[PDB]
Structure 1
Amino acid sequence: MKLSEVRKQLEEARKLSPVELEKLVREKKRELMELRFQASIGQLSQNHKIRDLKRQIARLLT
């Protein structure tokens, strides 16, 4: 159901859409590395987080 919430407000992401979208995903990938890092030390990441993060990016990138 995560999908519903995210996608709708990305066409709501149309106050300055394209430009803003580029920016948005840019910050999103950061929230990604931070994780892959935390999931390299060991105790700081509980899976999914990383996954769901990528899968949002997947859609955001439309």
Structure 2
Amino acid sequence: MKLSEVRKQLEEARKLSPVELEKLVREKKRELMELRFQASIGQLSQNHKIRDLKRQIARLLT
């Protein structure tokens, strides 16, 4: 259901849009690295966080 949620947020991301798109993506990107960085060490990772964040990025990218 998280889809309907984030979607509206993105045309909502039309304060600055292409610019905030980029700002927001870059952010989600870091969170992703921070994530897999901790995922590699083992004792700081669950799971579904990644794929959810991965696809999260995708629709932002759209």
Structure 2-normalised TM-score? 0.94
- The equivalent residue for 2:15 is 15
Higher relative contact order (CA 8 A, sep 6+): 1
- The equivalent residue for 2:56 is 56
* Structure 2: segments with no counterpart, 5+ residues: none
Distance (Å, rounded) in 1 between the aligned partners of 2:3 and 2:15:
21
Moved over 2 A (4+): none
Deviation at 1:19, TM superposition (A): 1.0
- What is the total number of aligned residue pairs between the two structures? 62
Deviation at 1:22, TM superposition (A): 0.8
* Structure 1: segments with no counterpart, 5+ residues: none
Q: Percent identity?
A: 100
Deviation at 1:36, TM superposition (A): 0.4
